[PDB]
């Protein structure tokens, strides 16, 4: 009854935890019970993960948010107070949620793909992201599928990454879900299979969608740290 | 003129009521000598 992304062992139970509503969707997130209890194993059961949630160790996106099924989606920096645990969780190359450990100056921010820019009411420019941070007043040159950098103390955009040909992009969606390498090709079609294409070890080619891909930095310099093997 | 004036026979109204034999209390001769003019 589980998805593939959670890295959930089959010998666990019968009812799978539906995440509650929140920032991200159901299909692109993992809740805190499947995060803490059975992935990096700070708990043994739902009772004691509710106990540490009542103790309020979790500090995801700089706020506490004491809830069992809180849908932590892409790169919400899970922060735990004891042993200064800073966790940025991204996608691995085979579809799961690889939770990388980072440090404090990297967990002081996150980034987010812009979805739409609106002239909503009363002359106010407007920007949303995958956690829905409706932050005030970016520059006019925010296209769709660019990348804002959230402040995580206040909410303001601090840095901006422009989407164009020659940018380091992350793909979350479809049969390319979780690949990095961002350059063999660029092809913007007019309604589907439109993208920037991603290399491999032998620099192979790949096809995805615009909304299923979003930028993380430059060719060699992302200010996100990434795990390795 | 599709649904307009279907000259068909319909099921529940075919015996919805029943007639009456004498009907008018007048005679038909009383009709004729009523509105001859």
């Amino acid at each position: 009854a589980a998805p593939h992304h959670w890295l959930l062992d089959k010998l666990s139970g019968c009812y799978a935890p539906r995440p509650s509503a929140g920032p991200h969707k159901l299909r692109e997130s993992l809740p805190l019970i499947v995060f803490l209890r059975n992935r990096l194993k700070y708990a043994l059961n739902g009772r004691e993960v509710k106990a540490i949630l009542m103790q309020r160790h979790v500090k995801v996106d700089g706020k506490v948010r004491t809830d069992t099924t809180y849908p932590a989606g892409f790169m919400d920096v899970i922060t735990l107070d004891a042993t200064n645990e800073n966790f940025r969780l991204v996608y691995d190359v085979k579809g799961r949620f690889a939770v990388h450990r980072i440090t404090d100056e990297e967990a002081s921010y996150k980034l987010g793909k812009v979805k739409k820019v609106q002239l909503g009411k009363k002359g106010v420019p407007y920007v949303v992201t995958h956690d829905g941070r409706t932050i005030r007043y970016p520059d006019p040159n925010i296209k769709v599928n660019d990348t804002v950098k959230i402040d995580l103390a206040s909410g303001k955009i601090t840095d901006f990454i422009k989407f164009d040909a020659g940018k380091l992009v992350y793909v979350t969606g479809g049969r390319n879900l979780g690949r990095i390498g961002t350059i063999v090709h660029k092809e913007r079609h007019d309604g589907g299979f439109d993208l920037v294409h991603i290399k491999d070890s032998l620099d192979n080619t790949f096809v995805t969608r615009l909304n299923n891909v979003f930028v993380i930095g430059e060719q060699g310099k992302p200010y996100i740290s990434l795990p390795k093997g | 003129k599709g649904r307009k004036l279907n000259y068909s026979v319909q099921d529940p109204i075919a015996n919805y009521e029943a007639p009456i034999t004498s009907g008018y209390k007048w005679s038909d001769d009383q009709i004729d000598e009523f509105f001859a003019g």
Binding site: D9, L11, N38, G95, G174, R175, L177 | -
Partner: protein, 134 residues
Amino acid sequence: FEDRFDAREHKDRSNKSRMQAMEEYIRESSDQPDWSASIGADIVNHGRGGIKSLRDTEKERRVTSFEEDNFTRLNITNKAEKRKQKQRERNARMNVIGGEDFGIFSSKRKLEDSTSRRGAKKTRSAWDRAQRRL
């Protein structure tokens, strides 16, 4: 047309082709040892069961690893146990003789069809087979 996320094609199967004759030949020509038990420790119910097969001690090692790894006893879940424990022990006393399972020799399943005779490196060109050798 368009892509659609398929965990059944980026999921580790590795079991459609796991044949015990090939695996036994690999264990023979492995040139690294095999982690066998101290000899009495692997018989099960004072001999009322078998010894235990190699797949059964692999599965037991996996269960005890998961067991210690997240601090939970497994259970007596009725439907799965009435299937798997009774059918497993009855085919164990059918086919496992002295710690060795001979069930495979009584089973039609072609070796070379699924598990040998490579499909990706099929080399359907004279030039491709020439470059695959040289």
